[PDB]
Enzyme design. Structure first.
Site, PDB file in Angstrom:
ATOM      1  N   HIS A  45      26.419  24.873  -9.432  1.00 55.00           N
ATOM      2  CA  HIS A  45      26.149  26.301  -9.334  1.00 55.00           C
ATOM      3  C   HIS A  45      26.431  26.887  -7.957  1.00 55.00           C
ATOM      4  O   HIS A  45      26.668  26.158  -6.993  1.00 55.00           O
ATOM      5  CB  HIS A  45      24.685  26.532  -9.682  1.00 55.00           C
ATOM      6  N   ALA A  79      18.935  30.925  -1.796  1.00 52.46           N
ATOM      7  CA  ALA A  79      18.417  31.325  -0.488  1.00 52.46           C
ATOM      8  C   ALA A  79      18.494  30.216   0.563  1.00 52.46           C
ATOM      9  O   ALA A  79      18.832  30.470   1.723  1.00 52.46           O
ATOM     10  CB  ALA A  79      16.975  31.804  -0.624  1.00 52.46           C
ATOM     11  N   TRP A  80      18.182  28.987   0.161  1.00 49.70           N
ATOM     12  CA  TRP A  80      18.200  27.863   1.089  1.00 49.70           C
ATOM     13  C   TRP A  80      19.595  27.400   1.509  1.00 49.70           C
ATOM     14  O   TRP A  80      19.735  26.418   2.234  1.00 49.70           O
ATOM     15  CB  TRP A  80      17.396  26.694   0.509  1.00 49.70           C
ATOM     16  N   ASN A  81      20.624  28.110   1.059  1.00 55.23           N
ATOM     17  CA  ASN A  81      21.988  27.774   1.438  1.00 55.23           C
ATOM     18  C   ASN A  81      22.266  28.416   2.786  1.00 55.23           C
ATOM     19  O   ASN A  81      22.905  27.820   3.653  1.00 55.23           O
ATOM     20  CB  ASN A  81      22.979  28.289   0.396  1.00 55.23           C
ATOM     21  N   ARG A 133      18.503  27.531 -11.694  1.00 50.11           N
ATOM     22  CA  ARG A 133      19.776  27.945 -11.118  1.00 50.11           C
ATOM     23  C   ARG A 133      20.986  27.437 -11.910  1.00 50.11           C
ATOM     24  O   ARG A 133      22.015  28.099 -11.951  1.00 50.11           O
ATOM     25  CB  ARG A 133      19.874  27.524  -9.644  1.00 50.11           C
ATOM     26  N   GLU A 192      19.352  17.879  -9.954  1.00 51.14           N
ATOM     27  CA  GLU A 192      19.964  17.481  -8.693  1.00 51.14           C
ATOM     28  C   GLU A 192      19.226  16.260  -8.152  1.00 51.14           C
ATOM     29  O   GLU A 192      18.074  16.018  -8.505  1.00 51.14           O
ATOM     30  CB  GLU A 192      19.874  18.630  -7.684  1.00 51.14           C
ATOM     31  N   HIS A 249      16.930  13.904  -6.254  1.00 48.58           N
ATOM     32  CA  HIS A 249      15.622  14.185  -5.667  1.00 48.58           C
ATOM     33  C   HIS A 249      15.635  13.764  -4.195  1.00 48.58           C
ATOM     34  O   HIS A 249      15.692  12.572  -3.884  1.00 48.58           O
ATOM     35  CB  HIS A 249      14.536  13.417  -6.422  1.00 48.58           C
ATOM     36  N   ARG A 285      19.128  20.909   7.414  1.00 50.31           N
ATOM     37  CA  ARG A 285      20.179  19.913   7.631  1.00 50.31           C
ATOM     38  C   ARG A 285      20.731  19.842   9.052  1.00 50.31           C
ATOM     39  O   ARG A 285      20.885  18.753   9.607  1.00 50.31           O
ATOM     40  CB  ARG A 285      21.361  20.155   6.689  1.00 50.31           C
ATOM     41  N   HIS A 289      24.581  20.036 -10.674  1.00 47.80           N
ATOM     42  CA  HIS A 289      24.420  20.225  -9.242  1.00 47.80           C
ATOM     43  C   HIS A 289      25.368  19.384  -8.397  1.00 47.80           C
ATOM     44  O   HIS A 289      26.169  18.613  -8.919  1.00 47.80           O
ATOM     45  CB  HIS A 289      22.969  19.917  -8.876  1.00 47.80           C
ATOM     46  N   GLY A 290      25.258  19.540  -7.082  1.00 45.67           N
ATOM     47  CA  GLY A 290      26.124  18.819  -6.166  1.00 45.67           C
ATOM     48  C   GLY A 290      26.152  17.309  -6.293  1.00 45.67           C
ATOM     49  O   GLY A 290      27.225  16.722  -6.425  1.00 45.67           O
TER      50      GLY A 290
END
Ligand SMILES: [NH3+]C1CCCCC1
Lengths: 255, 253
Positions: free
Chosen positions: B10, B14-16, B61, B88, B90, B99, B187-188
């Site tokens: 996706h 916000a946390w991006n 998401r 995604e 865990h 990060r 997810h990623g």
């Protein structure tokens, strides 16, 4: 012992706003209709509803309504199932026509029969009809449990019940009997058909039942899956009766 | 190839922008992430994709991403199925951490190891963690195929494949063999996990695979459901490569 479920019809789109029969034409919700769905979601959240399954028709407006309600509830993960058997009643050739114009051309009495009677069948939609192609050329009707050439070209309320009842009995009712909390995002007449059945409304009395758009409908069923009492509307009763009158008035001539 | 399948991660949340490990935190897509989903749908429509079934995780998401994709396609009626097994990876205790901050404190190489290693398991999330309750108290995890206390508290990419593979074998693979056109909205890292499996990527090579957000991935499989070539990102390769670099750069000072 007793079971409760929620059913409702989506908010009004562009056509119904200008008083035109929409039926199987896959029209999307407008801004107002989207807000109406969100409002229903907020009401259900207030009641702390925790749905287990959601059933909708294959008309995108009922699917989107359900998606907005689930978002409002933070329950987007709840399983959704869509079926043409929950589709709005097929208005045949009347699709796209203006209800008030029909009242002027055929009289209010005839329009009331077409709209609310149980047995009166609308003239069938023909290939020459302005909206025939966009309806029957969609892939969603190529993978139904009935062949594309078998799908209705018009339906009386009785016809609707005949194709909707099997879906209710076979896929929805079992979940109700398992104590699951169910949401049915449907339409004006497909909902009237289900209610006629569940409440045991006579072929004659159903003609006087009109459902307001974007309003949660509460129904409690007993051990035999029959209504314990008549369906109820969640919200401001005055606004709800006013909304019902508006729908009734679309089939009437001015002043 | 005999069969074709589409999978994707996706758009952003916000946390991006905050560059924090989101993982099992049920964060919603932001304005941009939604547009990313709409662009995916438009790209898929441009290629005539007609899905018969859609699989997502239970994180909203990925569900909203599928919904936005289906809307653009005029395919909102296509059946959707969701499972925690597509969730995604865990990130355990690392959830909520920035990060770049970690890269500054422990070194970019250390962060890269934690992000892309196939075997390293992050520290399990504890009840004292700022987002423990927001995760394990959700009803969606009270109705999964395994008990709530059985759900992971942290996972290496290997752990992800181990709980995702059963779902692929049992639910997804059979549908693909039946000839159905499938869309997997994941997810990623759960996507990297499936790619490793389908493409037979080595434990060492998977480390170098980073997926861009909101980009459809075309996978062509044979009669044995093995990839008949590396995955194919659908779109302009230059913009896609920059999108990949963006994800990588999140771990650089
Ligand atoms: N369509 C409207 C009917 C009255 C309550 C709010 C929705």
């Amino acid at each position: 012992s007793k079971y409760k479920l929620i059913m409702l019809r989506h908010g009004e789109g562009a056509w119904n706003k200008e008083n035109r029969f929409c039926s199987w034409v896959d029209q999307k919700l407008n801004s107002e209709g989207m807000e109406e769905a969100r409002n229903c979601g907020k009401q259900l959240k207030a009641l702390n509803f925790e749905f287990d399954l959601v059933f909708t028709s294959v008309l995108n407006r009922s699917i989107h309504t359900a998606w907005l309600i689930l978002e409002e509830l933070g329950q987007e993960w709840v399983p959704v199932e869509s079926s043409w058997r929950l589709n709005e009643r097929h208005y045949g050739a009347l699709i796209g026509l203006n209800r008030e114009q029909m009242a002027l051309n055929h009289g209010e009495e005839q329009v009331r029969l077409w709209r609310r009677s149980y047995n009166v069948t609308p003239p069938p939609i023909e290939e020459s009809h302005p909206y025939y192609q966009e309806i029957y050329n969609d892939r969603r009707y190529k993978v139904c449990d009935v062949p594309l050439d078998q799908l209705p070209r018009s339906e009386s309320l009785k016809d609707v019940l005949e194709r909707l009842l099997p879906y209710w009995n076979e896929r929805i009712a079992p979940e109700v009997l398992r104590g699951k909390t169910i949401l049915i995002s449907a339409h004006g007449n497909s909902s009237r058909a289900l209610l006629k059945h569940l409440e045991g409304i006579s072929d004659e009395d159903i003609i006087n039942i009109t459902l307001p758009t974007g309003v949660p409908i509460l129904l409690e069923l007993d051990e035999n899956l029959r209504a314990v009492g008549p369906h109820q509307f969640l919200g401001d009763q005055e606004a709800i009766q006013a909304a019902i009158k508006k729908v009734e008035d679309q089939g009437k001539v001015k002043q």
